[model samples]
Target chain A: SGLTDETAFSCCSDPDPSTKDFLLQQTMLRIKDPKKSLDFYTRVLGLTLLQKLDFPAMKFSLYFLAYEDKNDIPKDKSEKTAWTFSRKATLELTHNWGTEDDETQSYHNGNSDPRGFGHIGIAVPDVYSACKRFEELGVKFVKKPDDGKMKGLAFIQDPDGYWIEILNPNKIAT
Target chain B: SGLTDETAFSCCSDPDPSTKDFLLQQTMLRIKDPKKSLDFYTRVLGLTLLQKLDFPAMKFSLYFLAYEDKNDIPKDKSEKTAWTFSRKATLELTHNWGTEDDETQSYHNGNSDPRGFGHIGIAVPDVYSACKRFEELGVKFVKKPDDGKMKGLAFIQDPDGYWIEILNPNKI
Candidate 1:
């Protein structure tokens, strides 16, 4: 059955003074073993490493990672990668190669339950089915899929204990 | 002393064209006890409960929470609460009170470190000092403040084992 159209509702006609969107940009993890963490992210998940750096000018060479397909290929190679890919979201992995004793400080702390600022969330199609597949693959779910008013959402921990949220909005547009 | 001015630098921009100021929005968490979590966040973190809803038709009622102060308050009430006292961020606490088993599928799997998605970071003025203060408060530190380039960044675990990154980018 086709979904009911709600064009009759005019609640949004008035300017909403509090209409603003705030979001998290990237989740940075400081890993003692960069290679181990890097392997887990790439091999387990289907993210491709877009870029990597190990120069002295910057202590950390940020690795831009993303899930790609033929649809993501650009018509013009020379166009800026970010601009070409701005249509979709991507994940970023940062590997810091500098010594621990260097002059800069980069440590974070938060409370017990979902402390400090935890992981980034990716939208998925089905939480139950996805989680089931993950379980079969030996992936452990920190929290199982659950339904809420905002939509269906779930959380999982990365190798470094970083929490990642997966959301299923339920209705997919054709 | 004032901040150093550098004229030698030409243009600084995000290398990723897709990158803008901050890319992701809110990260959601599932809790066994919503009331306890709500109390801790409100009392300790200084977040205000923005709205509370209980819609049976929707199957859940989300409690919208945010940092309160003059900046977030409506213009009409901004005068009442000084904006200067407000924190920089807001948090939304969602509680699911549904009966259907299908609703349970929305939670996250607690394992596997997927790439690109790591720990969310918050900017601070001093990492070392903040860690020290948090330590005294009995909060556990996943990684203590160190001195390398990424050294200023510290990692901590939330009650649910979710990692949070804190750093002082000003030093860089």
Candidate 2:
């Protein structure tokens, strides 16, 4: 028999259950000030505090927050599952509480030709209405929500000049 | 014991799964040139071809790309799994294919920032090694890989000047 015919082989077939469990958990962002970042995420964006862990030994605190809506609750009361209204998307705020000050303050200066990482986004039901509400709250509006090829989209900056895109999906579908 | 008590419950007992799925799937991005944008992503970046359908016929091509090393692949393989690499990222590119002329030529002129969508990032095993490799390949490096409070990190611009971050997660 030839080399290919002489070799005896058996294929090992096993269900890869772990592959199904893989998920895109969170997006980590490094901010200058943790307190201010946390306040901005929680207060301005209305993200709820999922958990706050302090690694005092490392001089850092990992704060996780998520957007919660009424749709995350689990069905099947007897399943003994925790009702979660939030997805796995998380903002990790690293607090350099006692680090030495560096001259490079801003990652992406307002005038840099090629800026660094941009912003996070959220979809709302009404873009114009939400922008008006945000304006009433003293929040600076970078661009008023307008209908484009992808429907309504508007931009806003957080306290740190990081951009956020607010959009309405309904318009895009049409 | 009473209906009013059950109604007083502030939290939901059971919720629809479709709504949760929708929230997780929604992503918004602003692109400059839908055609050139597609070329860079499909050819240069080596993302997988998903779907290209047009509007009147509900046609729009959706391309999904991810790093080769990414451990996370969605449960649905039919959902346009584009470029797979050894990292954790999923890049979704859509081609609107506008009918207007190249008035601004946004991506070519590097003026996509007018919309406020800044940039996207990707993680690498070693920033210095990747930068060296990219340099050898004629790719321009915006910022050299250097060590900082966040460990070794570097920035590179795509064909459209969109910044891509290459850093070691071990250092992060």
On lDDT, the leading prediction is 2
Q: By TM-score, how accurate is candidate 1?
A: 0.40
Query: Taking the tens digit of each residue's C-alpha lDDT, what string does model 2 give over B42-159?
Result: 4333333233323444333443343222234433543322212112233544433442244654432122322223334444444576567667657666677764444467666665
Q: Cα lDDT for residue A3, model 1? A: 12
Under CAPRI classification, how is model 2 graded?
incorrect
Model 1 lDDT per residue over A1-174, tens place: 111113111111221122112122234445433454445445444444443434456555454444444245454434434332232234555545542334543333221322334455544445566566556656656676654334445666665556656544332211
> What lDDT score goes with residue A145 in model 1?
67
Which ranges in model 2 have alpha carbons more than 4 Å from their true place?
A1-19, A69-87, A98-104, A109-112, A147-151, B1-172
Deviation (Å) of B11 in candidate 2: 22
All candidates: interface RMSD: 14.1, 15.0
- How many residue-pair clashes does candidate 2 contain? 17
TM-score between predicted and true chain B, model 2:
0.54
Of candidate 2 chain B, the 10-residue stretch with the lowest lDDT total is: B80-89
Score chain B of each candidate by TM-score: 0.55, 0.54
Per-residue lDDT of candidate 1, residues B1-172 (tens digit): 1111121011112122221122222344443334545553443233455434344654554444443432454453333222211212233344455322344333322223222235544444456765676676576667787844456677765444445565553443
By DockQ thresholds, what CAPRI class is model 1? incorrect
